[PDB]
Amino acid sequence: IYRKEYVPFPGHRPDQISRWYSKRTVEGLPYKYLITHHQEPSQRYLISTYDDHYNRHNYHPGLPELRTWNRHKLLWLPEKADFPLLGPPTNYGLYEQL
Amino acid sequence: MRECISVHVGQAGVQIGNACWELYCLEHGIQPDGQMGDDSFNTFFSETGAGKHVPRAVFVDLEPTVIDEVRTGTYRQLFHPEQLITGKEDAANNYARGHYTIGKELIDLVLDRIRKLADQCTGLQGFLIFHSFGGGTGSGFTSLLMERLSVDYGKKSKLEFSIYPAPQVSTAVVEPYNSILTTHTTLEHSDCAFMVDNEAIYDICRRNLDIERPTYTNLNRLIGQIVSSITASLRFDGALNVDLTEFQTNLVPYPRIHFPLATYAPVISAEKAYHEQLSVAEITNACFEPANQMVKCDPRHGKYMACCLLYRGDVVPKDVNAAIATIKTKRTIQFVDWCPTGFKVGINYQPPTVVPGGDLAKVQRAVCMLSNTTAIAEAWARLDHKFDLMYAKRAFVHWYVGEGMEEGEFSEAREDMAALEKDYEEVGMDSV
Amino acid sequence: MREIVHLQAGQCGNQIGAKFWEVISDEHGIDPTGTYHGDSDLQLERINVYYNEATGGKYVPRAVLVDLEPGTMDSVRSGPFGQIFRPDNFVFGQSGAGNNWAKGHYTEGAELVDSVLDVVRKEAESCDCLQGFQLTHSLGGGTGSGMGTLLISKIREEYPDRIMNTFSVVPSPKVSDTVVEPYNATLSVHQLVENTDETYCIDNEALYDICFRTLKLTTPTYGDLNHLVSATMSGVTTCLRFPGQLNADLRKLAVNMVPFPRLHFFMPGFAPLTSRGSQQYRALTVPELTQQMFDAKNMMAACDPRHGRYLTVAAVFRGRMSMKEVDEQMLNVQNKNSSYFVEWIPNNVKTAVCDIPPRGLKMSATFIGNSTAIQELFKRISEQFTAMFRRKAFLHWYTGEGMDEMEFTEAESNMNDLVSEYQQYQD
Amino acid sequence: MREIVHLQAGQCGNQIGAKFWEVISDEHGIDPTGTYHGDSDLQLERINVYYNEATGGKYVPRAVLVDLEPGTMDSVRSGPFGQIFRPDNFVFGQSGAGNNWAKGHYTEGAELVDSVLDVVRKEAESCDCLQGFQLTHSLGGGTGSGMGTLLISKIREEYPDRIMNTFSVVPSPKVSDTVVEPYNATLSVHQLVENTDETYCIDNEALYDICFRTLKLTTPTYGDLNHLVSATMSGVTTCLRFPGQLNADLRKLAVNMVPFPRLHFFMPGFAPLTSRGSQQYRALTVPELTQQMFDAKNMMAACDPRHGRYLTVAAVFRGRMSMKEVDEQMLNVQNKNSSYFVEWIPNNVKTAVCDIPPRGLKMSATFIGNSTAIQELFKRISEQFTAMFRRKAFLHWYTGEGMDEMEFTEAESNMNDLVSEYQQYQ
Amino acid sequence: NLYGPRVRIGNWNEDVYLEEEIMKDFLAKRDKGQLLIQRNRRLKENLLRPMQLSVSEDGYIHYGDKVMLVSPDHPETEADLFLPGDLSLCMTPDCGLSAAQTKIPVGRNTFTILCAAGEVIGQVLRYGQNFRLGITGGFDDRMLYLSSDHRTLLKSSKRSWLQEVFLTHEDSYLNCWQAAFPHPQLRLEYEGSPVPANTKILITHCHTNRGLVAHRHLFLRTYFGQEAEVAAHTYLDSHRVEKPKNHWMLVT
Ligand SMILES: Nc1nc2c(ncn2[C@@H]2O[C@H](COP(=O)(O)OP(=O)(O)OP(=O)(O)O)[C@@H](O)[C@H]2O)c(=O)[nH]1
Ligand SMILES: Nc1nc2c(ncn2[C@@H]2O[C@H](COP(=O)(O)OP(=O)(O)O)[C@@H](O)[C@H]2O)c(=O)[nH]1
Ligand SMILES: Nc1nc2c(ncn2[C@@H]2O[C@H](COP(=O)(O)OP(=O)(O)O)[C@@H](O)[C@H]2O)c(=O)[nH]1
Ligand SMILES: [Mg+2]
Ligand SMILES: [Mg+2]
Known part of the structure; x- marks a missing residue:
């Protein structure tokens, strides 16, 4: 029964791909940037509170003087809801010297 | 480089080792002569400048033809042909024959080999001891081995898969003499003793696998599955890896309790695993059932004290935690008060590999359970009863005492077994 | 630097x-x-x-x-x-x-x-x-x-x-x-x-x-x-x-x-968390951020603030944001439920604001709070550990490794002191 | 020339x-x-x-x-x-x-x-x-x-x-x-x-x-x-x-x-010695060059200086930019570790500089050190020599070619002297 | 209880929202072309560029010839780890150098013989005359030079711990090599003779005097198989004669 059942057993190699399917279900590597991401994808969003307030002189494509009172709701938003994010981020030429 | 050595004693030890090391050469790609990314054969196999992976273990028996069959079977060039140790005369199902005469003449050759295997290893973590618990070689020569490697090697982990004799059916006639005397010596020199039976896996081979006339070869595969599920946290990568000394220090609370009980959950046939949904709830809930447990004993009669759940495959920790929670809130699974956590989780990343044309199938996820229970005192009180009947007859002592062993060693074989039952009853009581 | x-x-x-x-x-x-x-x-x-x-x-x-x-x-x-x-x-x-x-x-x-x-x-x-x-x-x-x-x-x-x-x-x-x-x-x-x-x-x-x-x-x-x-x-x-x-x-x-040199166990948290189905559906604004800041469901520990009482509470904000709305609303949550805030500290909240949120976020914040809800965390560990130490279980894996028995019963004595330290400001 | x-x-x-x-x-x-x-x-x-x-x-x-x-x-x-x-x-x-x-x-x-x-x-x-x-x-x-x-x-x-x-x-x-x-x-x-x-x-x-x-x-x-x-x-x-x-x-x-005449044994040591996979992870600045050329693990001899007291120290630094960080981080050492530097000699370091960098590295340094810890070297050599001359081992070879036993004892003398001569200046 | 995708049973909607966002991230990155495969399959194809060498009119080797470098088979059995042979020098990006079990020209293995002191494109290369090997990278259109500097603590071989051989774009004396006859009792007399094409020669450095060794017993693993390691060291048998591991063929 030792010789009969124990066979030299050619051909069949055990599966190694299914290692790495359960590797990635537990790790979740393509999911790591989808966890805390919110609203739309955006590569450039940051700006300082000095550069936009003292150097960039606020948002350019917005209304400079026009302040509408909206037909429905009790608010003058086109200065507030603008949320200035225009132009390049905080950059003044120090990556150039490094 | 985190090798643990496996030592197999007796006909039972070497025969379950053939199934244990078939799979090792199966799972790690090792064609059965020695040659062939991830993983670690260095944990269980060797290397050389020819690509060859020597099975770093030792098989010792007092029967020459079984080892001679290994040297003439399939794994000739695989095993290195002087680390397979054999003798010219068997113990003939006797304790003292394997303890005071046959053991002395062959132990120095065994200890020489395990020296030159420990020297090449830098990360020796522990010992795997595969021995028959009611035989001649596995009762006597194991006892000498445990006496010697527990003293010389200091504090290392020593896990044994003792082949516990079945309660109702038995092969021997002098089994309670061999069984009680070997667990006397190995009580103080072991770390966990995992009992398995032979009738239970015969039942599992019948009701779950739909193949009749089961032999020992179809049995040792499920023993091989359990050892593989235990050791693959070292052979392979996993989410929550569980090393070898976790069972050693995290399953036993007292030095004389170390008798846990093994269960392999997903037993299923080849025509049923394409054909059934493996679910994490269905696999570990059926593992608690008394009907599919590897020693014939009812855990409902006793209380669970510590448990260790080993998961292996496409398994997430949440489905482990959800399923282990619904076990905790179940009334019929009686659980001890003073050990309220009582659980361990181990995760591996592979389906268990399947033997060629066997009675098992390619399950994508498996659960191995190692739980210790005070209900096992019922299994040892039966051998207490069988010792009482056969020693009051003064039966068959002359084979034992006439071979150097003092008759009075039959005595302290029992009062310590009385206290070990007594220690199991006292830990067996609720505290309030 | x-x-x-x-x-x-x-x-x-x-x-x-x-x-x-x-x-x-x-x-x-x-x-x-x-x-x-x-x-x-x-x-x-x-x-x-x-x-x-x-x-x-x-x-x-x-x-x-x-x-x-x-x-x-x-x-x-x-x-x-x-x-x-x-x-x-x-x-x-x-x-x-x-x-x-x-x-x-x-x-x-x-x-x-x-x-x-x-x-x-x-x-x-x-x-x-x-x-x-x-x-x-x-x-x-x-x-x-x-x-x-x-x-x-x-x-x-x-x-x-x-x-x-x-x-x-x-x-x-x-x-x-x-x-x-x-x-x-x-x-x-x-x-x-x-x-x-x-x-x-x-x-x-x-x-x-x-x-x-x-x-x-x-x-x-x-x-x-x-x-x-x-x-x-x-x-x-x-x-x-x-x-x-x-x-x-x-x-x-x-x-x-932390007011006292032992009561330094805090309540970590992260405000802007929502599902991927509410991606373009949600206004990531301060009333949608501070309301979920103080909820017990957005807490990175097993504590409920509803059974305990806060001592001090805290948050840092990120992004280009005005903060009169985190000075009114952080005052409202301080004042709307005074049952959950301590009486003898007049101002429980601290405020600090950064200018950059994490990438992928437009305006984020994190949570921190000293609370007496760490009490139920430590007493649960205490009731679980004393229930096993009375029967001397698993000690030989802690005693045979060069550790005396005495630092075990000093370990419970120190934590029983600390749970009592959070007992005096429960109400 | x-x-x-x-x-x-x-x-x-x-x-x-x-x-x-x-x-x-x-x-x-x-x-x-x-x-x-x-x-x-x-x-x-x-x-x-x-x-x-x-x-x-x-x-x-x-x-x-x-x-x-x-x-x-x-x-x-x-x-x-x-x-x-x-x-x-x-x-x-x-x-x-x-x-x-x-x-x-x-x-x-x-x-x-x-x-x-x-x-x-x-x-x-x-x-x-x-x-x-x-x-x-x-x-x-x-x-x-x-x-x-x-x-x-x-x-x-x-x-x-x-x-x-x-x-x-x-x-x-x-x-x-x-x-x-x-x-x-x-x-x-x-x-x-x-x-x-x-x-x-x-x-x-x-x-x-x-x-x-x-x-x-x-x-x-x-x-x-x-x-x-x-x-x-x-x-x-x-x-x-x-x-x-x-x-x-x-x-x-x-x-x-060399403080006094006799004493003249020096413990050498290099400076820019990093691994191969850890070669591009370490900035090679003067700070990160003295730290290693004084650390005992670098000493190219087997007499950790901590056990002794440097009577003098050298530093043939090789590299370009190195004229203020060099001294500032050379007095620093003599100031922190102040027990591993004798007091009978005020300044204890001889700074030097070669504006040509060793091929590959941007900066290197060599520390010749005269610790009184070299007194250990001789000590072990003597403990061992004295163990064999006692039971006259191998002497036959030496005594034969042409050498009285007095020579051997005379040697143990000169050596034991140096060790005590060193001990005093410590 | 645990049904899969496209079936609306329990938290189906957020699982569906997982599908599109992953899908959209793929499909955006797909038609632009920043997947790993389409970045790597064009790195393979331009390195494994099918082309043909320059056949010699005579049995001799002229300058400017695009030539192969192949190390032949050996009966060497000192270490029984043995890549079966006919090993050819090849490109090795992660740029390093390695052997390969390749006999046909595939572009990453073709080497152009350049002139160090000579000027004419057509003239016979002779033994003991300095020459430089050259190769062009995939879509680089710029010449690389086979070079090897001295052995120090900072720059050496990967598997073996001897002197390495590497590629640079700079020109110096470190990227010039000379040929030698494999018979040291007849090497000196063959100084004036030109090199035959399909014969055993020794390639030695000129600032270092260490030959191009072809270590087989160590295996390097890259995107093209087990490929051994090439380094710079002279190996000498008991009878000071360069060992099989040092010979090379300028097959064309
Ligand atoms: N479960 C299981 N039990 C086995 C196996 N082989 C033997 N046994 C049991 O172990 C007991 C001891 O039998 P052996 O292993 O043949 O005896 P031994 O330990 O080699 O000692 P000797 O009889 O002297 O050769 C028997 O009663 C069997 O019931 C096996 O492969 N699986
Ligand atoms: N949050 C979190 N917890 C983890 C992670 N991995 C493990 N754990 C926790 O760690 C515990 C087990 O710790 P363990 O591995 O023994 O720590 P070790 O002794 O440092 O190895 C578990 O109860 C988990 O809760 C993880 O990736 N994240
Ligand atoms: N550091 C170093 N020591 C070496 C080297 N080669 C030999 N040695 C040492 O030199 C000693 C042998 O010197 P020996 O040959 O007996 O000197 P000789 O017989 O008079 O020529 C050995 O103890 C080695 O430790 C080397 O390359 N580097
Ligand atoms: Mg036998
Ligand atoms: Mg001068």
Whole structure:
């Protein structure tokens, strides 16, 4: 029964791909940037509170003087809801010297 | 480089080792002569400048033809042909024959080999001891081995898969003499003793696998599955890896309790695993059932004290935690008060590999359970009863005492077994 | 240029740093190779409070990743952001504490601490000035807890005046993954209270809910959960890294929160969390952020604020935001439910505001609070540990390793004192 | 035009020379043949120091290679850079010493000194201002231990002003290679305590530790060990071969490193020694160069200075930018670690600078240190020698060639003296 | 209880929202072309560029000939780890150098013989005359040089710990080599003779005097198989004769 059942057993190699399917279900590597991401994808969003307030002189494509009172709701938003994010981020030429 | 050595004693030890090391050469790609990314054969196999992976273990028996069959079977060039140790005369199902005469003449050759295997290893973590618990070689020569490697090697982990004799059916006639005397010596020199039976896996081979006339070869595969599920946290990568000394220090609370009980959950046939949904709830809930447990004993009669759940495959920790929670809130699974956590989780990343044309199938996820229970005192009180009947007859002592062993060693074989039952009853009581 | 040195302890700590040092690298702009391909100058100016400068541009991180097994220390070295940690800042043994506080603190874990202090002294004196240390580990094992508590007692001894952040992963109430869990937890808390200045409690079970009830995934995992843990840690020390309208540090944090030198167990949290189905459906604004800030469902521990009472509460905000709306609304939540806020402190909230949110976020914030809801956490560990210590279970895996019996009963005495310390301000 | 004649003696010295002459052959840019296929002009400006000149651009090294048996010299001749040495400057006999200082210093050895002294006269007079000779040996053999010291004696007798520098590989603490090494060494220090102006103790054990703990290297070979000796043999004569800001020759280093006369054993050590996978992760700044060149793990000898007290310290720094961070981080050390620096001497460090960087590295440094911890070296050598002379072991060999037992005791004396002489200045 | 995708049973909607966002991230990155495969399959194809060498009119080797470098089979059995042979020098990006079990020209293995002191494109290469090997990278259109500097503590071989051989774009004396006859009792007399094409020669450095060794017993693993390691060291048998591991063929 030792010789009969124990066979030299050619051909069949055990599966190694299914290692790495359960590797990635537990790790979740393509999911790591989808966890805390919110609203739309955006590569450039940051700006300082000095550069936009003292150097960039606020948002350019917005209304400079026009302040509408909206037909429905009790608010003058086109200065507030603008949320200035225009132009390049905080950059003044120090990556150039490094 | 985190090798643990496996030592197999007796006909039972070497025969379950053939199934244990078939799979090792199966799972790690090792064609059965020695040659062939991830993983670690260095944990269980060797290397050389020819690509060859020597099975770093030792098989010792007092029967020459079984080892001679290994040297003439399939794994000739695989095993290195002087680390397979054999003798010219068997113990003939006797304790003292394997303890005071046959053991002395062959132990120095065994200890020489395990020296030159420990020297090449830098990360020796522990010992795997595969021995028959009611035989001649596995009762006597194991006892000498445990006496010697527990003293010389200091504090290392020593896990044994003792082949516990079945309660109702038995092969021997002098089994309670061999069984009680070997667990006397190995009580103080072991770390966990995992009992398995032979009738239970015969039942599992019948009701779950739909193949009749089961032999020992179809049995040792499920023993091989359990050892593989235990050791693959070292052979392979996993989410929550569980090393070898976790069972050693995290399953036993007292030095004389170390008798846990093994269960392999997903037993299923080849025509049923394409054909059934493996679910994490269905696999570990059926593992608690008394009907599919590897020693014939009812855990409902006793209380669970510590448990260790080993998961292996496409398994997430949440489905482990959800399923282990619904076990905790179940009334019929009686659980001890003073050990309220009582659980361990181990995760591996592979389906268990399947033997060629066997009675098992390619399950994508498996659960191995190692739980210790005070209900096992019922299994040892039966051998207490069988010792009482056969020693009051003064039966068959002359084979034992006439071979150097003092008759009075039959005595302290029992009062310590009385206290070990007594220690199991006292830990067996609720505290309030 | 105030310097923070980060420490990892064990398999839990290494996986935290594996999921934290990708967040800072993707936020500051560091690639997998270390070269700074940033998008702006306002990430590079304070690249000093983290990754250290090495020639070629390589901004090699400053973190002593430690572990008593050679298992997870490899998972990091071989992954997305693995080739960044100096190939020597990795101190890995081979034995393994094996879920035991004893051999992780006294016998086997005490041989590797000389190899860590040789590394810690090496890279904490090269900085101009050290702001303090920080460490992440789990109380549930023998490596993160055993050697983590020995390392934390050492680095406090030579440097007493430095501030210390420790992010302990406390046990879960319902589902535990270790039978010897209340042994490694209680005797770690004893080593934690006189050797720390501030401690955050992280729960495995409490963060399983958020990825299912708030973020709504059927398969939350450790990788999906350590990002939440790394989110608040990158969310605490932002004013050290970036400017803003009201800037703070780890010490304006520390002084406002913990009133007494023992009551430094806090409530970590992360505000802007919602499912991927409410992606373009939700206005990421202050009334949608501060309302979920104080909810018990958005808490990174097993504590309920509804049964306890806060002592001090705290938040740092990010992004270009006016803050009259976090001065009115943080005052409303201070005033709408005064049953949950302490009476003898007049102002319970602190405020600080940064100017950069994390990448992918437009306006984020994190949560911190000292509460008497850590009381139910510690008494649950206390009731679980005393229920096993009376029957002398698992002591020989704690006694035969060179540890006396006496520090066991001193361990419960110290924690019974601390639960009584939170008893006096319950109401 | 100062020049340094090289004198490699013994197998060990002929393997330390194989690497030194290959290392100094790159610094200056001389290919095996002997020509100059280099780049800068500051490479052939001071070749005179460790290089002569013949037909065309040939630069035959000024080295008198010595070995009792003709096997080690033969290996060199037929090696990578072996057709550079003049075939005549290879002085070898036929029989050896058999690890016997007696033979090397009294028998087969005084029968060769004549021919070796002839060449060291034809390569010394063949030069003007000679900074001094220089020897590379292995106290613990026979040619290197005996002939080495026989030469070191008969060269100070004829040229008694030139600087006798020697790079001796002292017997290791534990690592034992030759069994009769206690004797050879104990009998070869009495000479190296009164016939050298600057001896270096480069134990092989320390070398393995810098190729294991610092320069993570699974398999260290004798070439790596030899490289670490050659690197610290080119830094001490670096301000003589390349332009500098604060120059420092081989005398302006002794003058300010040998406190009182006798004491003259120095513990060498390199500076920019990092691994291969950890090579691009460490910024090579002056701070991160002193930290290692003073750390005990780097000491190229086996006598941790913590156990002692530096009587003097040197630092032949090599590199460009280095004139304020150098001193600020050189007084710092003397200020923090303040118990490992004697008080009877105010300033204890001799700073130097060579504005030419070692190929590859941007900056390097070499620390010659005279700790009173070298008193351990001799102590172990004596504890062992005294153990064998007691039960007169091997003496037969030594006493036979021609040596009274008084000599042996006289040796233990001179040595035990040095240890106590050191102890007092500590 | 645990049904899969496209079935609306329990948290189906957020699982569906996982599908599109992952899908959209793919499909955006797909048609632009920043997947790993389409970045790597064009790195393979331009390195494994099918082309043909320059056949010699005579049996001799002229300058400017695009030639192969092949190390032949050996009966060497000192170490029984043995790549079966006919090993050819090849490109090795991670740029390094390695052997390969390739006999046909595939572009990353073709080497152009350049002139160090000579000027004419057509003239016979002779033994003991310096020459430089050259190769062009995939879509680089810029010449690389086969170079090897001295052995120090900072720059050396990967698997073996001897002197390495590498590629640079700079020109110097470090990237020139000379040919030698494999018979040292007849090597010196063959100084004036030109080199035959399909014969055993020794390629030695000129600033270093170490030959191009072809270590087989160590295996390097890259995107093209087990490929051994090439380094710079002279190996000598008991009878000082360069060992099989040092020979090379300028097959064309
Ligand atoms: N479960 C299981 N039990 C076995 C196996 N082989 C033997 N046994 C049992 O172990 C007991 C001991 O039998 P052996 O192993 O043949 O005896 P031994 O230990 O080799 O000692 P000797 O009889 O002297 O050769 C028998 O009663 C069997 O019931 C096996 O492969 N699986
Ligand atoms: N949050 C979180 N917890 C983890 C992670 N991995 C492990 N843990 C926790 O760590 C505990 C086990 O800790 P253990 O591995 O023994 O720590 P060690 O002793 O340092 O190795 C478990 O109860 C988990 O809750 C992870 O990736 N994230
Ligand atoms: N550091 C170093 N030591 C060496 C080297 N080669 C030999 N040695 C040492 O030199 C000693 C042998 O010197 P020996 O041959 O007996 O000298 P000789 O017999 O007089 O020529 C050994 O103990 C080695 O440790 C080397 O390349 N480097
Ligand atoms: Mg048998
Ligand atoms: Mg001067």
